[PDB]
Design an enzyme around this catalytic site. Structure first.
Site, short mmCIF file in Angstrom:
data_model
loop_
_atom_site.label_atom_id
_atom_site.label_comp_id
_atom_site.label_asym_id
_atom_site.label_seq_id
_atom_site.Cartn_x
_atom_site.Cartn_y
_atom_site.Cartn_z
N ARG A 141 -0.01 -11.87 -4.46
CA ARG A 141 0.77 -10.77 -3.93
C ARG A 141 0.15 -9.52 -4.21
O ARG A 141 0.57 -8.66 -3.94
CB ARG A 141 2.19 -10.95 -4.38
CG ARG A 141 2.31 -10.89 -5.67
CD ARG A 141 3.62 -11.52 -6.25
NE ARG A 141 3.47 -11.72 -7.76
CZ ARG A 141 3.30 -12.98 -8.50
NH1 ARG A 141 2.97 -13.79 -7.85
NH2 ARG A 141 3.10 -12.77 -9.67
N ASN A 142 -0.72 -9.46 -5.58
CA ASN A 142 -1.45 -8.32 -5.87
C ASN A 142 -2.64 -8.11 -5.56
O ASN A 142 -3.38 -7.04 -6.10
CB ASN A 142 -1.04 -8.12 -7.32
CG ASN A 142 0.41 -8.06 -7.97
OD1 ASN A 142 1.20 -7.13 -6.86
ND2 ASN A 142 0.83 -8.39 -8.79
N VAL A 144 6.70 3.45 2.31
CA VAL A 144 5.12 3.42 2.51
C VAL A 144 4.63 3.40 4.05
O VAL A 144 5.43 2.83 4.69
CB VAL A 144 4.29 2.46 1.91
CG1 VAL A 144 2.87 2.56 2.12
CG2 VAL A 144 4.63 2.44 0.28
N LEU A 157 5.34 1.18 6.83
CA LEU A 157 4.71 -0.21 6.72
C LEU A 157 5.65 -1.11 5.95
O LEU A 157 5.64 -2.15 5.86
CB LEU A 157 3.50 -0.08 5.64
CG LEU A 157 2.39 0.94 6.46
CD1 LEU A 157 1.23 1.19 5.33
CD2 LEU A 157 1.88 0.14 7.81
N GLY A 158 6.66 -0.40 5.11
CA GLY A 158 7.57 -1.35 4.29
C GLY A 158 7.77 -0.49 2.76
O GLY A 158 6.94 0.31 2.43
N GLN A 159 8.83 -0.90 2.17
CA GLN A 159 9.34 -0.22 1.11
C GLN A 159 8.30 -0.48 -0.22
O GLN A 159 7.77 -1.45 -0.42
CB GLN A 159 10.78 -0.83 0.69
CG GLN A 159 11.71 0.12 -0.37
CD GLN A 159 11.92 1.39 0.11
OE1 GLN A 159 11.76 1.79 1.27
NE2 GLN A 159 12.74 2.24 -0.53
N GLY A 160 8.20 0.60 -0.87
CA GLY A 160 7.33 0.55 -2.08
C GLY A 160 8.24 0.76 -3.31
O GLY A 160 9.40 0.90 -3.02
N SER A 161 7.74 0.72 -4.51
CA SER A 161 8.54 0.99 -5.84
C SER A 161 9.42 2.24 -5.85
O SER A 161 10.27 2.25 -6.24
CB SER A 161 7.47 0.87 -7.07
N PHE A 162 8.71 3.33 -5.29
CA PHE A 162 9.55 4.49 -5.29
C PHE A 162 10.16 5.02 -3.78
O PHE A 162 10.88 6.04 -3.85
CB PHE A 162 8.73 5.63 -6.08
CG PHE A 162 8.66 5.41 -7.54
CD1 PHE A 162 7.43 4.60 -7.93
CD2 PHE A 162 9.34 5.82 -8.40
CE1 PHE A 162 7.30 4.44 -9.41
CE2 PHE A 162 9.18 5.83 -9.77
CZ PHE A 162 8.21 4.99 -10.13
N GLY A 163 9.74 4.43 -2.94
CA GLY A 163 10.06 4.60 -1.68
C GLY A 163 9.31 4.14 -0.59
O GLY A 163 8.31 3.28 -0.74
N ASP A 210 -3.17 -1.70 -5.22
CA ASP A 210 -2.73 -0.62 -5.91
C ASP A 210 -1.63 -1.30 -6.96
O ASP A 210 -0.90 -2.18 -6.79
CB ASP A 210 -1.99 0.16 -4.95
CG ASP A 210 -1.24 1.50 -5.39
OD1 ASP A 210 -1.65 2.17 -6.47
OD2 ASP A 210 -0.23 1.76 -4.95
N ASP A 214 -0.93 -9.04 -13.89
CA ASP A 214 -0.19 -9.69 -12.94
C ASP A 214 -1.30 -9.98 -11.73
O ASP A 214 -0.93 -9.66 -10.59
CB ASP A 214 0.70 -8.71 -12.47
CG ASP A 214 1.95 -9.46 -11.51
OD1 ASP A 214 2.06 -10.60 -11.36
OD2 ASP A 214 2.86 -8.50 -10.97
C1 LIG Z 1 -1.50 -1.35 8.86
O1 LIG Z 1 -1.31 -1.50 7.54
C2 LIG Z 1 -0.64 -2.36 6.79
C3 LIG Z 1 0.12 -3.45 7.62
C4 LIG Z 1 0.87 -4.20 7.03
O2 LIG Z 1 1.64 -5.16 7.84
C5 LIG Z 1 1.49 -6.67 7.68
C6 LIG Z 1 -0.08 -7.10 8.26
C7 LIG Z 1 -0.18 -6.61 9.65
N1 LIG Z 1 0.74 -7.52 10.59
C8 LIG Z 1 0.49 -7.26 11.95
C9 LIG Z 1 2.12 -7.13 10.14
C10 LIG Z 1 2.24 -7.13 8.75
C11 LIG Z 1 1.12 -4.34 5.64
C12 LIG Z 1 0.12 -3.36 4.89
C13 LIG Z 1 -0.70 -2.64 5.61
N2 LIG Z 1 -1.06 -1.76 4.63
C14 LIG Z 1 -1.31 -1.16 3.50
N3 LIG Z 1 -2.20 -0.65 3.20
C15 LIG Z 1 -2.14 0.02 1.40
C16 LIG Z 1 -0.97 -0.20 1.04
C17 LIG Z 1 0.04 -0.84 1.27
C18 LIG Z 1 1.30 -0.87 0.83
C19 LIG Z 1 1.74 -0.69 -0.29
N4 LIG Z 1 3.03 -0.72 -0.45
C20 LIG Z 1 3.52 -1.51 0.51
C21 LIG Z 1 4.90 -1.94 1.08
N5 LIG Z 1 4.98 -2.66 1.79
C22 LIG Z 1 4.13 -2.79 2.90
C23 LIG Z 1 2.71 -2.29 2.90
C24 LIG Z 1 2.41 -1.64 1.65
N6 LIG Z 1 0.06 -1.43 2.77
#
Ligand SMILES: COc1cc(OC2CCN(C)CC2)ccc1Nc1nccc(-c2c[nH]c3cnccc23)n1
Ligand SMILES: [Cl-]
Length: 300
Positions: free
Chosen positions: A155-156, A29, A21-27, A169, A151
């Protein structure tokens, strides 16, 4: 400092990770599947927060204790912690999945693309109000549990598959929004801060209400930067001097009127999150009565 495993501990065998999904605070996600984490659900699509393979024991302990703050909340409008894998490595924290990501990114995705293709009209008043009440419900629950968010910003906030908005979270820094903060001497979200917080650095539920007002402005502008034409230093001066964000282009009256109540200079004159909900409860979707903190027996 140490981490004590508890009732939230989940067997690694019950966990599977797929899409990053992408980078989080410690690693990193990841998206994944967790067995037996939600009642009456054999399997649930979950978000899995991990700690990078190289990270120290001091850092993976901090990650575990920081994530553990979420354990006390049980609110439909607050992203749920579902489990922790503290035994063995990689270290995992299992969270409720929010497939549409953070609200700032979701709102920005609704902006019309610069092409000749058809586009969905900007969100209706009804859809914006639904978002406002869900956010305000999560905030009313957090205030009832003696927390100050500090905050509150689009974005949050996170967006679920069914478009439900929830308080995200805690401490999930999306690096793309690093310019939404300013170090003056900690890193602070100055464009979302109340005049009293800009003066003494103290935050209350009244300054969370101020931020909620900025969140509504983000919904109505599709997450433009607050005070766009001003420097971080100019924002401090403008807001401490009584300056306010302008009514967005085509913003419905009722939504701007709610923003104005949140941006009253005197914190004591702003409405509470419960008073905010009361004022828009007739505009909420039928289901709100069944899942909200506002309508629950907990709201006493
Ligand atoms: C399929 O779950 C997702 C798709 C997603 O992607 C975007 C939305 C969908 N489009 C198509 C593409 C862009 C973004 C988030 C999520 N979920 C989700 N749930 C709970 C926590 C997090 C999360 C926490 N720390 C992060 C840091 N970096 C990305 C995601 C997170 N993330
Ligand atoms: Cl409240």
């Amino acid at each position: 400092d140490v981490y004590v495993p508890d009732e939230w501990e989940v067997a690694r065998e019950k966990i599977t990770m797929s899409r990053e999904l992408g980078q989080g605070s410690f690693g990193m996600v990841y998206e994944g599947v967790a067995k037996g984490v939600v009642k009456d659900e054999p399997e649930t699509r979950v978000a899995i927060k991990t700690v990078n393979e190289a990270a120290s024991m001091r850092e993976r302990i901090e990650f575990l204790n920081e994530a553990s703050v979420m354990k006390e909340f049980n609110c439909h409008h607050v992203v749920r912690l579902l489990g922790v894998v503290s035994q063995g490595q990689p270290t995992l924290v299992i969270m409720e999945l929010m497939t549409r990501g953070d609200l700032k990114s979701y709102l920005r995705s609704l902006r019309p693309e610069m092409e000749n293709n058809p586009v969905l009209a900007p969100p209706s008043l009804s859809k914006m109000i639904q978002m406002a009440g869900e956010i305000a419900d999560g905030m009313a629950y957090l205030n009832a549990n003696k927390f100050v968010h500090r905050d509150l910003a689009a974005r949050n906030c996170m967006v679920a598959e069914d478009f439900t908005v929830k308080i995200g979270d805690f401490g999930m820094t999306r690096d793309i929004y690093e310019t939404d903060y300013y170090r003056k001497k900690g890193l602070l979200p100055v464009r979302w801060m109340s005049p009293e917080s800009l003066k003494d650095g103290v935050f209350t539920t009244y300054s969370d209400v101020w931020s909620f007002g900025v969140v509504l402005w983000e919904i109505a502008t599709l997450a433009e930067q607050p005070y766009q034409g001003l420097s971080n230093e100019q924002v401090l001066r403008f807001v401490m001097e009584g300056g306010l964000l302008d009514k967005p282009d085509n913003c419905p009256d009722m939504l701007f009127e709610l923003m104005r109540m949140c941006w009253q200079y005197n914190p004591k004159m702003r409405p509470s999150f419960l008073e905010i909900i009361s004022s828009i409860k007739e505009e909420m979707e039928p289901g709100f009565r069944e899942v909200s903190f506002y309508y629950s027996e907990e709201n006493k």
